[PDB]
Design a binder for this molecule. Structure first.
Ligand SMILES: [Cl-]
Ligand SMILES: [Cl-]
Lengths: 460, 464
């Protein structure tokens, strides 16, 4: 079993033993998976030798791009010295110390302390436990309710599924008590005839209304992604975040900013919370933290919350919390992002160039809107732009059609319902972006022809 | 910031920024954490130059021991070639395929399918969601309750905490609805006047009682570690597991064997499941999977459960599910365990030697019982073995004193209540085992003296 085995045999072995995330696995197995074998820069190769443009950066995470062999070098060296030790036994190691200090340095405000975990789901479980423990330690054991949003995504543990706003996840043991969901600020889909800025305000004010309905004395936290990622890159109207922040200042609740996707340069700053000018008590991190080179996530925590949690035993943590190889890899990732000025590249070169071409996609007959913040973008596909119509088919039928075209054209672009999404490596160049657009326009053209032929150009 | 920066300075930076698991972090920060800088074989070094015998194998996980540079080479090679790709987009990579195939091969019976996760806690979240979805898919959405046990440990997410049986965890948003806990088969502490085999039967029959109290139609699954690890290495009487298995056959519920600790040679087999002769529908894996050299976990799932789950979208999984570097490292770990015959080393050499010396610990005045399965072991500390007495002090008071003596004597042996536990690397030699026991006996003698100094050598009911 090597990259030398014929593709059909690899697929057969995968189908026989490997259960894939977010899949209908029996059908997946008979259809056969695409086998990815190497990557460099923004490009992948599969087992057949296709050259594929990865406009999704792995899974919103390979921020410095592929082929950064400095990280392999750092990983091997750490693995030889100390490949594992725990942080449970009044013990630590130097990679955990250095990474936590670097994260404290990069995080805004007084976000100065780090609880490590394996990834974003595990870190949001830390957050749930930590905010509720925080309020107990403050003498307010009644404050337990966590407010989140419809169409949010916060991970895939039972409790993290519960925070997210995905009905299909809730229905598969994705619920826990004392989570409440307000509306998402998706103007395109839900704004009606409201002005986008008035819509932003009304959607934000739902937080205050929820707090008063539940009782401030019962509310522990509000959690939100700065830009909704897995929900389809939903960019809130500009009025939304300042109104949320005002509400959070007024009431005695913790603000958690989920930075799992937005983190580490994705929105054109170190954190989406800097882009949106918000002041969270906790930030959830993973993905770009290590550019996906090693599994690691965590919670960056303000002074007050860390002090209060520190006053007694906090009966929480994971074997791999602070893993020294993963921590060394993450530190090397951050060193590249910082020392090679990747954020300047994003802000001055890649983000402006992408924006101009991305937003120009509304000239395509299928494209009703084109939204982008920094290096995450979406387009809404519609059969009638005049009424911002949804398709009459199940959401995702059209998105799936376009997605299959992108993959057949050697482009990784994902769908979320009938929105198409990108999230390229931060290091992508104007030249690479041009080629991305050649493949996007070809896929959109071919998708539209398929949609028209199959009689699917129908409004709901 | 390097292994060369002085200890006090490293400690100050750790206190400034690093929140630790399962700790009182403010007090920890003022004490100063211990900084581990390197590890070779079964030995750690700290930043003061102390050499420490790691009788806990990191955290029940460094099964091939430290210093196996083959995994570093395999890791670096994978990272240069393909450091990450997702398994979400109808895509896969060779490390995931090779590892899933290898796990299927080592797993018993028809446990042939693997769902990857980041570690044990995430993998038990997979299991909760999978067993519940399974019953929904069969048109029985009432089957939601998972039965587990007091003093179980199944991870530290909200829901896998709920499955664990630790009150301190549950109190800190660590409990969810539809989890029911039956009693644990700790004969030493809880057996009363019962014979151990009668106690084992009665402890197992609580599963049947709970199923009938809840209604079989409401029960999705029972989950258990073959040997309770974090709970104090609690080895059930011989009668216990055959009776749990009979009950799990009798009633229509799924059986989850949590193999997070017991897996990968720890009980002297590939799985605690083999050792105890049980037939689970799902096994949880992590820790020993990669000997802790890379974060990775998962769930190994029997044919029929996998098939039913596979019939529709299973809306679950993690960014780092199947991580190709972690998966390459895990495969190389399994290669070493298998091709250097480490399980033979355990079965023929280390386990019988360890058992001999461990069980002889009961000649020590503090040591009431000494229990051991393969390479996981515990002792119960007592002021009076003849009545299996508990100390007058709250459990853990005496265990703490002992643990502090172990730590000062450069031995990683931990306490749970007034039980001391070890879980050394599988590859420990009889000679290293001897040196471990020199440190164990010294620590027990100093513990006994410290207990006497504090006025704590009294049994329960006898404070006055
Ligand atoms: Cl939309
Ligand atoms: Cl006990």
């Amino acid at each position: 079993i090597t990259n030398h085995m014929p593709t059909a045999e690899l697929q057969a072995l995968d189908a026989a033993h490997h259960l894939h995330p977010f899949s209908a696995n029996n059908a997946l197995g008979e259809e056969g998976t695409r086998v990815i074998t190497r990557a460099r820069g923004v490009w992948l190769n599969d087992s057949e030798g296709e050259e594929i443009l990865d406009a999704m950066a792995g899974l919103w995470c390979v921020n410095i791009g592929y082929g950064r062999d400095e990280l392999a070098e750092v990983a091997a060296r750490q693995m030889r010295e100390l490949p594992y030790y725990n942080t449970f036994f009044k013990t630590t190691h130097v990679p955990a110390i250095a990474l936590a200090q670097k994260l404290a340095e990069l995080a805004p405000g007084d976000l100065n302390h780090v609880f490590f975990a394996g990834g974003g789901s595990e870190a949001n479980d830390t957050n749930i436990r930590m905010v509720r423990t925080y309020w107990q330690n403050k003498g307010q054991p009644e404050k337990t309710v966590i407010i989140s949003r419809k169409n949010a995504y916060h991970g895939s543990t039972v409790a993290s599924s519960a925070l997210g706003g995905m009905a299909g996840m809730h229905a598969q043991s994705g619920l826990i008590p004392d989570v409440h969901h307000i509306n998402q600020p998706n103007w395109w889909a839900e704004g009606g005839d409201m002005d986008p800025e008035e819509f932003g305000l009304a959607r934000a004010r739902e937080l205050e209304e929820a707090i008063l309905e539940l009782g401030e004395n019962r509310v522990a936290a509000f959690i939100a992604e700065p830009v909704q990622g897995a929900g389809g890159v939903i960019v809130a109207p500009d009025s939304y975040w300042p109104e949320i922040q005002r509400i959070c200042d007024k009431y005695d609740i913790l603000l958690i900013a989920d930075e799992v996707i937005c983190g580490f340069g994705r929105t054109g700053n170190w954190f989406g919370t800097q882009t949106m000018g918000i002041r969270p008590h906790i930030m959830t991190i993973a993905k770009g933290l290590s550019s996906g080179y090693a599994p690691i996530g965590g919670s960056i925590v303000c002074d007050e919350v860390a002090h209060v949690i520190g006053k007694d035993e906090f009966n929480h943590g994971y074997t791999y919390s602070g893993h020294p190889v993963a921590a060394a890899v993450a530190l090397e990732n951050l060193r590249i992002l910082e020392e090679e000025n990747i954020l300047d590249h994003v802000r001055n070169v890649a983000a402006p160039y992408l924006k101009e071409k991305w937003e120009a996609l509304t000239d395509h007959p299928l494209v009703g809107e084109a939204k982008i913040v920094g290096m995450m973008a979406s387009i809404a596909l519609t059969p009638n732009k005049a009424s911002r119509a949804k398709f009459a088919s199940e959401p995702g039928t059209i998105g799936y059609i376009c997605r299959e075209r992108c993959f057949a054209n050697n482009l990784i672009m994902r769908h979320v319902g009938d929105r198409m999404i990108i999230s390229p490596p931060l290091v992508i160049t104007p030249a690479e972006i041009d080629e991305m657009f050649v493949r996007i326009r070809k896929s959109l053209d071919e998708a539209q022809a398929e949609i028209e032929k199959q009689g699917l150009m129908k409004s709901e």
